[PDB]
Design an enzyme around this catalytic site. Structure first.
Site, mmCIF file in Angstrom:
data_model
loop_
_atom_site.group_PDB
_atom_site.id
_atom_site.type_symbol
_atom_site.label_atom_id
_atom_site.label_comp_id
_atom_site.label_asym_id
_atom_site.label_seq_id
_atom_site.Cartn_x
_atom_site.Cartn_y
_atom_site.Cartn_z
ATOM 1 N N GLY A 113 0.869 -1.151 0.000
ATOM 2 C CA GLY A 113 0.000 0.000 0.000
ATOM 3 C C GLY A 113 0.913 1.209 0.000
ATOM 4 C CB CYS A 154 -0.934 -2.362 6.092
ATOM 5 S SG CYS A 154 -0.351 -1.829 7.723
ATOM 6 C CE1 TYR A 155 -4.704 -3.372 -1.433
ATOM 7 C CE2 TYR A 155 -2.786 -4.627 -2.139
ATOM 8 C CZ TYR A 155 -4.061 -4.141 -2.385
ATOM 9 O OH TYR A 155 -4.699 -4.422 -3.575
ATOM 10 C CG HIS A 162 3.116 -0.259 8.549
ATOM 11 N ND1 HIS A 162 2.147 0.686 8.301
ATOM 12 C CD2 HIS A 162 3.366 -0.864 7.364
ATOM 13 C CE1 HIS A 162 1.831 0.662 7.019
ATOM 14 N NE2 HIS A 162 2.555 -0.273 6.430
ATOM 15 C CD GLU A 206 6.509 -2.392 8.323
ATOM 16 O OE1 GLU A 206 6.428 -1.417 7.559
ATOM 17 O OE2 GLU A 206 5.535 -2.854 8.941
ATOM 18 C CB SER A 238 36.713 7.242 -6.816
ATOM 19 O OG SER A 238 37.811 6.738 -7.591
ATOM 20 N N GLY A 239 34.574 6.514 -4.146
ATOM 21 C CA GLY A 239 33.189 6.077 -3.874
ATOM 22 C C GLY A 239 32.805 5.737 -2.433
ATOM 23 N N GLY A 240 33.519 6.319 -1.468
ATOM 24 C CA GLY A 240 33.159 6.214 -0.062
ATOM 25 C C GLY A 240 33.059 4.798 0.465
ATOM 26 C CB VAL A 241 30.888 3.494 3.223
ATOM 27 C CG1 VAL A 241 30.943 2.331 4.217
ATOM 28 C CG2 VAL A 241 30.943 4.838 3.957
ATOM 29 C CG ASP A 242 28.406 1.655 -0.880
ATOM 30 O OD1 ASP A 242 28.256 1.597 0.368
ATOM 31 O OD2 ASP A 242 27.517 2.090 -1.659
ATOM 32 C CE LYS A 276 26.113 3.573 2.932
ATOM 33 N NZ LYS A 276 25.543 4.929 2.555
#
Lengths: 464, 464
Positions: free
Chosen positions: B55, B73-74, B163, B165, B217-221, B336
């Site tokens: 939903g 929910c839905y 919900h 979550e 180049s690209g931080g944490v990942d 993440k």
């Protein structure tokens, strides 16, 4: 009236205007002339007393003329130099009075363990005097400054190393009132009711039986001119209201309610809206916007008049714009406080009197790029919303100025609105700002995202 | 590993992902598929249980498989509608539990004057079910909803009108844990230690003795990808760090310090700066800017490799990237949360792990107009100052993201800088913002004035 008057010489300094204002508040007329002005002027002004001011960040023969003189800060320095004696950063200081004089009789903030009178003052530390001229004596001192105040008494010359005008010397207004009322012997008649009467008589003597046009467009100063003139010559006043397209949402309506519906008044509405959008059709340079709008303004007012056969034009020029360097300018000796006080007494409504200032070119600023109409229409709505809240949360009068600006830059897409409110940007509450931003983006489509100016009076200008 | 797994069908809804994340925190693997996905997939995925989300603001045969199914929910609605039974705004609501079942065993927020268990939950008031299906019994109610929860028990189908979550149902994670651990009978083996080991093994299996290029180049990942590979294949890893010119002031230095100086690591640096500026010389359109970057980024990486004779490229692709719709992608099943947990266990420094997200095209966004180099150099200064404070005032880790953006417009004349800080824009103190802004305008000449974004995640996008 006018017959009792103080001359204030301007040596720079934010607070020159403000010496003058304090003097007008005491009830005595004064003019503020630059120090490079000549004898003759000064002689023909023939003042009851002179006040030297200032220094930012030599006056000459004024000690020959019989009247008393008061030097403030730098004013005290040159007063020293130009008589005998030697000479050479701003903060609070506790001044201690030796000889309560004529200039300090009464006037005490504290008394001190040794029984000496003390004043809290806002000192100028750099305008130091090393040795007293002949005839002078130390009338006040501070820990770091052996002579923070001078006095002749026989010639009635006085010096102060601090600013009595500013609120940061609490008793300062009394010190100035002692100079003007007691030492210079001025009787206060600069009243409001007396200004109204003097001004009506002047408008009557100059204009006679012939008609006058006044532009209602322009806020408090215009409203005051129109009513002041209206009271002077009744039916002869013909009000003109040009919708330049550059005015706030409900200005046209608000003005008509006051001058047409209430209090009679012939009001001519001129459209000019298409006229102004052309003439500004290119033009990104904000200085050229200011020229074109304003040129096109005086043109419109000349056309009306060269049409209704009217010879006289009434303007709301006040004294601060005079001192910055066929007409009738009734307010040209008045500061803004005074215009406001006249406004209430003349019968204008409070909410018009204490409204935030609005610039001459109007909304032609507040749009960064080219001004367009597509853009003014969406700016009108964000601005309306912004001041609608503020009014609903009584925050409006807790700020000196508040408006929306339109940046033609677009983000994730739609244009960006900037909000400006100052007091020194205003510390409005998060949840309130959220409600204003939330509404602007939601209600006005084609926007997306609003921002708030966080930049102070010193580094950046108030208007963009 | 992967041996226990939950399928989550996505029927729209902010909180689709988040069900996933919660299940992952509980220690069980799961994937998130769109509800319209076909039988076969599902069969091939062979889940131990299913969760129906959804939903925003009809799956079919899933009830045939022996595995349990939870409807949120839905999800509860469609579950009801597709079995027998009839059907038809979000807020807090006090749920009373009838039958603690398997899904509510324990789990109580308050008891109650009548001695019955009560939960604070975050209801979807609109996804109501009028009448229970065959096999089902009401398992919970509220004052406004006679059946806020359903349960089969025989088929192990369960529904909730709220919900679990979200944080606004405090006990919600326990309810989810009860479904996944007890009803679906799964074992919590999705631990970060096991992910590291399975992942090292997967890399070794795939790449064997041959070399891999990983972009730093690209931080944490990126960082986590590179360390993970480094641990897997030692000297076979060759890092490449391209300075596009779109990176933050010290990013090159900080990554080299962690990869070149600390922990051996062959790191090749590539200049690329003149290259990226040429590619983006015109190009105001921000969709194109995004495209030209990235394109040029991939190109640079192919040229290295087709030069060092390397056949494998490693990337920090994560599961959210996969969701929105020769390479090795070790992070492609992780969220993440999990990538950060990994990096920390893998020995990367905390301040790198919990660093704010930096976008792929970097400072190409954050300049509104055409990215120029003259403009990036201004922006880098502005940005640097902004985060230096925050670090100093410990406000950095009290916000989810902070950055400057450069507007090429100018005001009373120099350019304007917008600051963005969110978590829902950041309610930072007046004193602190003033400090930042004063510093940005004084230290960087050619700026004058700076603003702050007051627009939330729902109306405006985080990045510009």
């Amino acid at each position: 009236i006018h017959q009792h008057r103080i001359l204030i010489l301007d040596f720079g300094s934010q607070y020159a205007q403000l010496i003058a204002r304090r003097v007008r508040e005491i009830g005595v007329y004064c003019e503020l002339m630059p120090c490079d002005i000549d004898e003759e002027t000064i002689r023909d002004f023939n003042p009851h007393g002179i006040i030297l001011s200032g220094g930012p960040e030599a006056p000459a023969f004024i000690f020959e003329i019989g009247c008393p003189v008061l030097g403030i800060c730098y004013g005290m320095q040159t007063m020293a130099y130009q008589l005998g004696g030697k000479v050479n950063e701003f903060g609070h200081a506790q001044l201690r009075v030796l000889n309560p004089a004529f200039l300090f009789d009464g006037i005490e903030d504290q008394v001190s363990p040794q029984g000496e009178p003390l004043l809290d003052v806002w000192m100028s530390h750099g305008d130091i005097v090393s040795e007293l001229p002949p005839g002078f004596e130390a009338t006040a001192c501070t820990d770091n400054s052996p002579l923070a105040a001078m006095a002749d008494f026989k010639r009635r010359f006085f010096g102060l190393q601090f600013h009595p005008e500013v609120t940061h010397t609490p008793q300062g207004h009394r010190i100035l009132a002692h100079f003007v009322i007691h030492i210079c012997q001025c009787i206060p008649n600069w009243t409001t009711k007396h200004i109204i009467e003097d001004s009506i008589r002047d408008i009557q003597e100059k204009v006679g039986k012939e008609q006058v046009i006044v532009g209602l467009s322009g806020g408090v100063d215009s409203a005051v001119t129109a009513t002041l003139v209206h009271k002077a010559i009744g039916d002869q006043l013909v009000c003109v209201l040009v919708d330049t397209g550059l005015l706030r949402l409900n200005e046209v309506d608000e003005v008509l309610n006051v001058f047409q519906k209430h209090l009679g008044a012939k009001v001519i509405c001129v459209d000019a809206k298409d006229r102004f959008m052309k003439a500004l059709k290119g033009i990104s340079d904000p200085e050229e916007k200011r020229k074109i709008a304003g040129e096109q303004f005086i043109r419109v007012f000349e056309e009306q008049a060269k049409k209704l056969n009217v010879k006289w034009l009434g303007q709301g020029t006040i004294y601060p714009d005079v001192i910055e360097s066929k007409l009738i300018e009734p307010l040209r000796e008045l500061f803004k406080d005074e215009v406001r006080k006249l406004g209430l007494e003349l019968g204008l409504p409070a909410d018009l009197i204490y409204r935030h200032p609005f610039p001459g070119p109007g909304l032609a600023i507040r749009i960064l790029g080219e001004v367009s109409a597509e853009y003014i229409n969406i700016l009108k709505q964000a601005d309306a919303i912004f001041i609608e809240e503020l009014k609903k949360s009584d925050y409006y009068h807790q700020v000196s100025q508040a408006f929306a600006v339109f940046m033609p830059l677009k983000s994730v897409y739609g244009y960006i609105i900037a909000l400006r409110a100052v007091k020194q940007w205003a510390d409005l509450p998060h949840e309130f700002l959220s409600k204003v931003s939330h509404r602007i983006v939601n209600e006005i489509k084609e926007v997306s995202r609003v921002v708030y100016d966080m930049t102070n009076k010193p580094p950046a200008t108030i208007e963009w």
